[PDB]
């Protein structure tokens, strides 16, 4: 119920394979190259993680707490406000481990360092504890 959704059974194993389901598709494109396979699958991952966790606020269902979760986004309400629980940090280590493989692949370029890193800082800046209720100029 959006406070216990990433701490159920088998949500981690179905989150790793969703990256592989995204990567084996994007590696299977004719007019593309393998640097802009791992460049492309890093933007699509960190855009979904920023739109499904840091923009959508509320529940798809109707919470019987009279909408106490209405103003808070989905990151701010995992496991009822505690920060470093067992499954909140796994969603922070995972864009890092993807970033290292996209660092070994693409062979350490310039403008792909421009595009991969600022898409990697764009998912980690709101994941700090000292940026909990702040919404900067929007939403």
């Amino acid at each position: 119920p959006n406070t216990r959704v990433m701490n159920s059974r088998g949500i981690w194993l179905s989150y790793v394979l969703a990256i592989g389901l995204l990567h084996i598709v994007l590696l299977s494109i004719p007019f593309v190259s393998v640097p802009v396979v791992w460049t492309l699958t890093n933007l699509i991952h960190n855009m979904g993680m920023y739109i499904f966790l840091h923009t959508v606020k509320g529940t798809p269902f109707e919470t019987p707490d009279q909408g106490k979760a209405r103003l808070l986004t989905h990151w701010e309400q995992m496991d009822y406000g505690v920060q470093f629980t067992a499954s909140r940090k796994f969603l922070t280590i995972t864009p890092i481990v993807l970033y290292f493989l996209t660092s070994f692949y693409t062979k350490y370029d310039q403008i792909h360092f421009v595009l991969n890193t600022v898409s990697l800082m764009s998912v980690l800046i709101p994941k700090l504890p000292q940026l909990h209720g702040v919404r900067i100029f929007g939403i």
Partner: peptide, 28 residues
Amino acid sequence: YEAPAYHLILEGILILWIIRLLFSKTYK
């Protein structure tokens, strides 16, 4: 191979960010 200028420095920050992140254990 093995040597960009201002990238392994930034990759060296995040690999030390994880070990801090793996040991925090608590909040409100």
